[PDB]
Design a protein around this ligand. Structure first.
Ligand SMILES: *[C@H](C)[C@H]1/C(=C/c2[nH]c(/C=C3N=C(/C=C4\NC(=O)C(CC)=C4C)C(C)=C\3CCC(=O)O)c(CCC(=O)O)c2C)NC(=O)[C@@H]1C
Ligand SMILES: *[C@H](C)[C@H]1/C(=C/c2[nH]c(/C=C3N=C(/C=C4\NC(=O)C(CC)=C4C)C(C)=C\3CCC(=O)O)c(CCC(=O)O)c2C)NC(=O)[C@@H]1C
Ligand SMILES: CCC1=C(C)/C(=C/C2=NC(=C\c3[nH]c(/C=C4\NC(=O)[C@H](C)[C@H]4CC)c(C)c3CCC(=O)O)/C(CCC(=O)O)=C2C)NC1=O
Ligand SMILES: CCC1=C(C)/C(=C/C2=NC(=C\c3[nH]c(/C=C4\NC(=O)[C@H](C)[C@H]4CC)c(C)c3CCC(=O)O)/C(CCC(=O)O)=C2C)NC1=O
Ligand SMILES: CCC1=C(C)/C(=C/C2=NC(=C\c3[nH]c(/C=C4\NC(=O)[C@H](C)[C@H]4CC)c(C)c3CCC(=O)O)/C(CCC(=O)O)=C2C)NC1=O
Ligand SMILES: CCC1=C(C)/C(=C/C2=NC(=C\c3[nH]c(/C=C4\NC(=O)[C@H](C)[C@H]4CC)c(C)c3CCC(=O)O)/C(CCC(=O)O)=C2C)NC1=O
Ligand SMILES: CCC1=C(C)/C(=C/C2=NC(=C\c3[nH]c(/C=C4\NC(=O)[C@H](C)[C@H]4CC)c(C)c3CCC(=O)O)/C(CCC(=O)O)=C2C)NC1=O
Ligand SMILES: CCC1=C(C)/C(=C/C2=NC(=C\c3[nH]c(/C=C4\NC(=O)[C@H](C)[C@H]4CC)c(C)c3CCC(=O)O)/C(CCC(=O)O)=C2C)NC1=O
Lengths: 65, 159, 169, 160, 160, 159, 160, 160, 160, 160, 160
């Protein structure tokens, strides 16, 4: 059970740390019980969540994931 | 048990090692005894729920007491329905040969569910112990051992 | 890290007893000292960045070898590090001023100080020397804006000294 | 402000807000009406404050008026006028607000990288806001002045 | 964001000083903060009892907890309790801030995407949030229950 | 509450922001009322433990019942000693002004302790509620509000 | 998923006990597991020989390995061998599970997206999987080659 | 390591083939594996009851749980339960492996360093492991309780 | 990629040896590398002066640095300087490589997505890159300013 | 070390002469030395009575002097009296020096190691030192009992 | 150990007789022993002058001999001279043995433990050993100064 998420997290603190200023827009797969804290961490930075999509998993199935 | 070996060899980049193929062949051999044990627990369900409610309400009378959760006919019917659910999941685990399709439906989030329902989990563990005792009386020795296996897993899981 | 009110709580918790009269006496002491402590910390906070510069100036007035060949504040690359250590000592001294203990200086400053300073070749004598240029200046600034008794301003710099101290007696 | 602090904390650690923090909330709510009256006073006469501030600047440092300086030229001379008013607008917003961080976010985060490749020097900004501080606490009542001084000297140290 | 921070932002993007309407808004917030804090305290008292009463009102003994329903598996029942605790906690944060922006930023951002991905029924969630709102409006009183129900209905309306 | 602001500004590289200095000055002002409330709860402890045991054993009689944990004089003495401990931690939290030195000693690992002791946590929460009611009767209105603050934190923590 | 796990799931979502048709399905699986295990063993014997014979049957000496083709570069030849080894290995897993869901979950999920992104020819891949199927049906026998060809044709049909 | 892996290693470092004494060792292990597995199952049944009974036997109502003792704070009580659960779980692993090397590799490596750093009393830990050993030897029987007590006494002897 | 690596790749995917047209391309690159290196050196000299002059030409004293504009907040001014330094640095890399593929791979990949997500004005960015191009074409000369303006106009055209 | 020697050391490691703050510290010590000497005399009067009253307050008629306790054997009772006499005597030395360094150097150095090696209960020792502190604060008065209780609580805190 | 004893040991642990490579090693040692003995004699001549010149080169007139430094107290100056005399003497022993094992066995065993326990600065010790090495390489010549500097740099590298 994996999700395909596109998201965008600006740190808002690169100007006082002088970091690499790398890209903040990604399309990644995340597993089932992991997307929970990923959701939460992306919302911690005020990040926009563009689109959540099912990669792996049939919904409504109970045994066998 | 085939999904266990498949995801086990799937995390690695290797194939299924032939010792795992030996354990799959042995489980395939024992599947007929597994099916007979599951059918014997299947057809005699209401006896097992009756004797489990018997031994539980003899053991812990607080669910019977009005401060407890299983007070009244509706709540005691929900209680025996929970015991029916756990017997059903035990038959699933008996067929599957490994405790994954029973833990996925009955174990993995049970503590917070029973905590936010008010019921104690130790009484549920005693109920599954009573189910194990009644199925041990119902089956033969090599069948009661192999049933008390998965019943033992549920009793350890609810605690 | 323990406050002046939480250190009493630890001392009374390890015995398992309740508050008595003596702990209430020291809490009354801390609670009538707090209004003066906050004003002293605001006065030190206001002019802190110039305090660091004058502390550097008098520190180089004292020992010439600090800004000479065989010293540690030679280039600006090695000067900015000494000035930010002045910044650090003043910052945690203000932390210990509002807390009222020396446990902040113990737990966050002094605990690995010998290891870094012996590791980087950094001296210790000129460091405590600079700490006390800082506290003379800070005493002047606290005495400027009001507050008459300045011994609570006086103590945390000296505690930093006594643990950075290479004790020879 | 304080509600930002308590809410970001209590969310960051997955609990409800503690009760000492709620007591800090309601003593802030009582302190707010004196905050409203002092920010109304500073919104009354900002003209005098920026006029004093520019005047004390051009008494303090003569190199901005000398050619080759930053106040030389009419455009940037007229600009520094409203720049002073921007900083005291941020002071009014801050002296109302319980914390300096929503004002730190607006005008304090990247000061060095901004003014550094802009032309103006950061050793002049501390004299600018020193003049603003002198011109604000003449124009207020006494303990209100003592309450609004730390926001000024916060911006002063955040410059240099 | 706050109500304070929203007022400061709305005054800031115009370059406007704090005029009397903004001071009215801040003084109304400083008046209502008393019952805001008291309501947040008593909601933080017994959040588990509120969630238990809400599922006993709306979701229990339906087909949803029967097999075939979305709350049949016990991990799904635990996830249901987690989602309802989230709705109540973030509604408490939005009630104490006095501004629903944290609901838009932290809860309602990508939530319909998730609930249509997992096959979570939306109408049963809306009825569960409604039962949450009725239980906490009974528990806290009508006067703070109005402001609690405003943000819970905000979550319910954005979810639909 | 000073350690809270100090580690709060210490995670950042910034100093203590003067709004935090305002909250420290206000706590310093309210410390005298805090000390009077703590002494009033201090000298009247045995009344509060008596009325808490009263209201608890009237509310939940299963600890009195022999299947429960607090059966017999020794176990009921340990029960009232636990209530004495929680009243002591509440006085610590009243003085400190913020719930850190009471959560550090009574909250942070209490669920697994009471689970491996056999006692239910809801009865402990009802005991702290009874302590809050008795201290609300003992104090004035503005004192009972500020005591029921930290008592409310403990009641929310034990659940 | 398994065939066992699929039967248990189909009996579970109805709340149904294990009726006689499900027991027939499980007993048919327990009958066929013998040749399933023997076929998986001899396919795990010589997978490299199967992939070598398949590329020698279908892909070699074409324009695909000539310059301009997609298998001209030697890293692309190694990637081709990797993809064919993946198809054979996951077809072995789906043959031993007796359920093609792992092909849908682990192989056929985002594969047409990748092969149209990289410009990989799809028809040559389908013919290579066909040559894989012919070689392993010759190697294992007809009786297990049918079940191997079912999942290899499942990969080929989902790829197209 | 195993007992099997230890026998294979001892035969390997000599370059020796499997002689009859090593086959005797492996056949003795294959004889004892029955009660090894049954003992591991019933110890995995009620590990929490074993730890509860052990602290009720040895550590409770002492000065250790009184203030001043090392188990006074509730996080320290939880850490005590964690350490006893670790001792029981790794003793179960060493019982099923039939070789105490995993105790030496995973538990007894830097444990006296940690317990003398934190000020943890060692003798009370030894008595708690002794009470664990008595409870599980009563629970599992004498015949597997001997092998359980061997590895628990190994932990106790290495701790001292 | 390079111009050398692009020529080698275009000769490789045909299986072609290095014919005379590819040798002409490589010898033209080896002729132009002199002024390429000298231009890269003097652009690496004073990149901060180029960015300062470009914002003073295009972005300063507009509504963009006024409140309401996207460069009002000082962290947003620092982010603007950061983005312009990125454009100049990657244009220097593409000028010295003689191939704009690194602009397509490292800058222009997901940049319109980011600038439409944040609400960054695109036309002001294009005019700022234009002012960058005019300043560096004045600073380096016309002969290398043509090749610098080619890649800066490549960034400007891909941005639009 | 002394308070005098600590002041001299803190002035020495800086190379500093004796400034006025150090002279204030030494003059405060020379003021407090009167009651320091009088307190040390009356504590040296009846140390055996203090230890007797402390064990009669805290340790006697418990389970500690019963069989099974750590003070059951009469050599262990004599060792208990010896340890309490040590705590009182070294607290007298630290009171007269005005500096707790001799407690850190001579008592608290390896004491938790010894008390965890022998199985000595730590909490009962802390309560015995507490009873010592109460008895000597009653015997000497409050004004010197504060300074006696500071070093006795130092021993109690370092022991825990 | 020696170089002779190391050669004999390396031939012994194989059970090997003295082959020609070992005889080459022993004959090279018997060739170099002339200058080894002459160097050891002239280093034993004036060891005090070498230590005096080394502290005058490296450690004197620094902050280390000032108050606050580790060589301020005169017993610490005497301990410094003792440690440098130890380094020179054991380097002489390792030079005459032709094997650095006595440095590993007698000097470098627990020396970093001691120098981090006492707070001895390690880098100043390394620079003092470096000044020792330069002085004795000047005094003895280059040809034996190489072998002296090898073991002194061995002490310096093991110390760091
Ligand atoms: C002024 C017209 C002339 C001048 C004067 C000057 N310099 C200082 C102080 C310092 N100078 C340094 C210098 C450097 N650090 C480096 O890394 C390098 C690179 C090689 C240099 C040149 C430092 C570290 C200081 C501070 C310590 C000190 O006093 O030396 C002063 C004193 C300023 C004061 O009172 O604070 C003065 C008057 N230097 C020039 O460039 C002009 C020729
Ligand atoms: C200045 C008064 C003295 C001096 C200072 C000096 N320090 C350094 C380098 C470092 N100093 C620290 C110090 C601290 N880190 C902490 O976390 C704390 C507590 C909050 C303190 C006090 C650290 C970590 C460094 C390493 C650099 C870094 O921060 O990563 C130098 C540089 C040494 C060098 O040569 O590079 C100097 C010069 N030196 C003096 O002469 C004064 C006596
Ligand atoms: C197959 C996986 C599965 C589990 C585990 C499960 C548990 C479950 N138990 C419930 C209630 C209940 N469960 C019990 C339990 C008990 N009686 C006692 O005293 C003992 C503690 C225990 C059983 C002997 C009681 C008394 C209720 C009714 C409680 C109430 O109405 O609040 C409910 C809510 C009512 C319902 O919809 O049935 C659920 C969902 N449901 C599931 O689908
Ligand atoms: C809200 C926080 C904030 C502020 C206040 C701010 C100011 C600001 N000052 C600017 C320029 C400037 N600012 C100054 C400032 C000064 N000259 C002096 O001598 C004095 C020391 C000082 C104050 C009067 C000068 C001279 C310029 C012109 C620089 C130039 O264009 O050459 C500019 C660029 C041109 C413009 O848009 O006007 C901005 C945006 N930006 C911000 O984000
Ligand atoms: C703070 C805002 C926020 C929310 C709400 C959130 C929800 C959320 N709910 C989830 C699952 C779930 N959510 C529900 C909830 C429901 N289904 C029903 O039938 C009811 C109508 C409703 C409960 C009232 C259930 C049953 C699942 C389980 C699906 C599964 O995990 O198999 C998941 C999938 C992974 C996981 O739980 O750990 C997320 C991310 N995440 C967030 O960050
Ligand atoms: C200050 C922090 C702190 C806490 C929280 C604490 C709890 C604590 N409660 C205990 C026992 C106990 N606690 C209770 C509790 C209760 N009676 C009930 O029925 C209710 C559920 C509840 C109180 C009203 C009981 C009955 C026992 C005895 C249980 C036994 O002997 O097994 C014990 C073991 C015996 C002891 O050494 O006192 C500890 C350590 N100790 C601490 O130092
Ligand atoms: C798998 C092998 C293994 C062990 C055993 C282990 C132990 C261990 N025990 C610890 C603490 C502790 N350990 C104990 C245990 C005891 N103190 C007593 O009084 C009793 C005699 C004894 C319990 C039977 C206590 C009370 C602490 C708390 C100290 C503290 O955290 O403040 C800590 C410090 C950090 C933490 O718990 O999370 C470690 C690492 N780690 C390991 O990896
Ligand atoms: C190497 C290629 C590359 C680019 C360009 C890049 C841009 C980039 N610009 C950003 C923000 C920004 N970008 C701008 C830039 C502008 N807005 C304007 O008004 C002007 C027209 C323009 C400046 C010329 C501003 C003002 C922000 C601030 C938005 C914010 O952080 O609140 C962000 C959000 C997070 C952050 O800065 O740290 C990214 C990722 N990342 C990359 O990897």
């Amino acid at each position: 059970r994996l999700f395909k998420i596109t998201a965008l997290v600006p740190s808002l603190s690169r100007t006082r740390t002088q970091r690499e200023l790398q890209n903040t827009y990604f399309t990644k797969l995340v597993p089932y019980e992991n997307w929970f804290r990923e959701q939460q961490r992306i919302q911690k930075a005020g990040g926009k969540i563009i689109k959540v999509e099912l990669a792996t998993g049939k919904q409504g199935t109970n045994a066998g994931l | 048990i085939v999904t266990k070996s498949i995801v086990n060899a799937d995390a690695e980049a290797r194939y299924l090692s032939p010792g795992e193929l030996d354990r799959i062949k042995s489980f395939v051999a024992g599947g007929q005894q597994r099916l007979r044990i599951a059918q014997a627990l299947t057809d005699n369900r209401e006896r097992l729920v009756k004797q489990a409610g018997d031994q539980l309400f003899q053991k812990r009378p607080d669910v019977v007491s009005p401060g407890g959760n299983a007070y009244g006919q509706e709540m005691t019917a929900t209680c025996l329905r929970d015991l029916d659910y756990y017997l059903r999941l035990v038959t699933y685990g008996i067929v599957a040969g490994d405790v994954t399709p029973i833990e996925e439906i009955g174990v993995i989030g049970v503590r917070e569910m029973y905590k936010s329902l008010g019921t104690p989990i130790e009484a549920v563990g005693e109920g599954v112990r009573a189910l194990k005792n009644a199925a041990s009386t119902l089956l033969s020795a090599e069948d009661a051992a192999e049933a008390g296996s998965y019943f033992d897993y549920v009793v350890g899981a609810l605690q | 890290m323990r406050d002046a009110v939480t250190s009493l709580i630890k001392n009374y918790d390890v015995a398992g007893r309740y508050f008595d009269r003596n702990a209430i006496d020291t809490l009354k002491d801390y609670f009538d000292s707090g209004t003066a402590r906050v004003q002293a910390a605001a006065a030190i906070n206001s002019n802190a960045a110039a305090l660091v510069k004058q502390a550097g100036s008098k520190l180089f007035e004292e020992l010439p070898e600090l800004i000479r060949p065989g010293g540690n504040a030679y280039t600006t690359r090695r000067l900015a590090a000494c000035l930010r250590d002045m910044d650090y000592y003043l910052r945690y001294a203000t932390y210990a001023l509002v807390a009222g203990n020396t446990n902040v200086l113990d737990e966050r400053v002094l605990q690995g100080l010998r290891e870094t300073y012996n590791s980087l070749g950094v001296p210790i004598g000129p460091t405590v020397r600079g700490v006390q240029i800082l506290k003379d200046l800070v005493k002047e600034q606290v005495a400027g804006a009001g507050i008459a008794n300045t011994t609570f301003v006086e103590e945390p710099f000296d505690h930093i000294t006594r643990e950075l101290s290479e004790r020879d007696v | 402000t304080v509600i930002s602090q308590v809410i970001l904390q209590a969310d960051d650690e997955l609990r409800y807000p503690s009760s000492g923090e709620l007591k800090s909330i309601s003593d802030f709510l009582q302190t707010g009406v004196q905050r409203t009256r002092i920010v109304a006073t500073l919104a009354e006469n900002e003209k005098k404050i920026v006029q004093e501030a520019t005047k004390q600047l051009w008494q303090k440092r003569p190199d901005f008026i000398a050619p080759g300086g930053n106040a030389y030229g009419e455009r940037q001379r007229a600009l520094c006028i409203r720049d002073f008013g921007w900083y005291l607008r941020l002071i009014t917003y801050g002296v109302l607000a319980g914390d300096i961080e929503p004002i730190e976010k607006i005008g304090i985060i990247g000061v060095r990288e901004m003014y550094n490749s802009l032309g103006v020097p950061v050793p002049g900004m501390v004299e600018a806001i020193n003049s603003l501080k002198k011109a604000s606490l003449d124009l207020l009542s006494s303990e209100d002045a003592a309450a609004a001084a730390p926001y000024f000297d916060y911006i002063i140290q955040a410059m240099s | 964001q706050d109500a304070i921070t929203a007022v400061i932002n709305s005054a800031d993007v115009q370059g406007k000083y704090l005029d009397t309407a903004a001071l009215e808004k801040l003084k109304a917030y400083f008046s209502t903060g008393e019952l805001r804090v008291r309501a947040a305290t008593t909601i933080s008292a017994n959040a588990a009892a509120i969630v238990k009463e809400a599922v006993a009102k709306s979701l229990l003994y339906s087909d949803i907890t029967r097999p075939g329903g979305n709350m049949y598996t016990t991990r799904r029942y635990a996830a249901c309790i987690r989602d309802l605790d989230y709705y109540l906690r973030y509604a408490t944060y939005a009630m104490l801030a006095g501004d629903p922006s944290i609901l838009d930023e932290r809860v309602l951002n990508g939530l319909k995407e998730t609930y249509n991905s997992l096959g979570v029924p939306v109408g049963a969630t809306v009825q569960a949030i409604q039962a949450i709102k009725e239980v906490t409006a009974s528990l806290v009183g009508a006067d703070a229950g109005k402001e609690m129900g405003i943000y819970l209905d905000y979550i319910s309306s954005g979810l639909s």
